[PDB]
C-alpha cells in the first residue's frame, strides 16, 4: 500500500502538471488558468503595493482581485467582463412592432 | 443601513461551503468527475437557493 496525500488550495504551490505555458494578454476579456485557479475576466496593470511574500489579493467580499504571475513576478488585476440586464421598451403590438 | 446590511449578508453567503468540499464552483468542476460534481453542485445550489 502506497498513499499520496496532496493538499489543494488556492495557492501557487510548487508541484504542478506537465502542461505547457502560454503568453499573457492585457485589456481583453479572456479566461485564464493560474496554477490551477480558473477564472474569466480582464487582466489589467496594478498599482497595488503587493508585499513580496504575498501572492494574491482579496476584496471586501473575499474574491480574487489581484494575482502575481508565477513565471514573471508581476501583479495583475482581475476585472470580470462587462454584464448587465436588458430591458425591452415597446408599445402595444397592436399599435406597432418597433422596440 | 437595513438595505445595505441585507445586501452585504446576501453577498457574504456566497463564501459558505454548505457541506461541499469547496465554496468555489470552478475548482469543484475542474477537480472532480461529473457523477460526484453533480452532488457537490447540488449542495451549493440548495444552499444558495
Amino acid at each position: 500500500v502506497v498513499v499520496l496525500s496532496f493538499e489543494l488550495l488556492h495557492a501557487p504551490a510548487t508541484v504542478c502538471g506537465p502542461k505547457k505555458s502560454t503568453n499573457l494578454v492585457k485589456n481583453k476579456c479572456v479566461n485564464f488558468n493560474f496554477n490551477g485557479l480558473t477564472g474569466t475576466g480582464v487582466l489589467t496593470e496594478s498599482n497595488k503595493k503587493f508585499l513580496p511574500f504575498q501572492q494574491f489579493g482579496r476584496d471586501i467580499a473575499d474574491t480574487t482581485d489581484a494575482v502575481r504571475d508565477p513565471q514573471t513576478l508581476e501583479i495583475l488585476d482581475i476585472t470580470p467582463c462587462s454584464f448587465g440586464g436588458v430591458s425591452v421598451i415597446t408599445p402595444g403590438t397592436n399599435t406597432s412592432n418597433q422596440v | 443601513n437595513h438595505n445595505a446590511q441585507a445586501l452585504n449578508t446576501l453577498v457574504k453567503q456566497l463564501s459558505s461551503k454548505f457541506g461541499a468540499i469547496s465554496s468555489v464552483l470552478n475548482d469543484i468542476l475542474s477537480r472532480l468527475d461529473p457523477p460526484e460534481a453533480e452532488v457537490q453542485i447540488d449542495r451549493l445550489i440548495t444552499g444558495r437557493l
Binding site: I60, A61 | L7, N8, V11
Partner: peptide, 28 residues
C-alpha cells in the same frame, strides 16, 4: 423657500437634511 444661489435649488433646511443623511462593486 428654494435658494436660487444653490445649483440644486434646495431650501437651507432641505440642504441640511440632505447633508445629514449618508463595496458597491462587490455587490454589483
Amino acid at each position: 423657500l428654494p435658494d436660487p444661489s444653490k445649483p440644486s435649488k434646495r431650501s437651507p433646511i432641505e440642504d441640511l437634511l440632505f447633508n445629514k443623511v449618508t463595496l458597491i462593486c462587490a455587490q454589483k
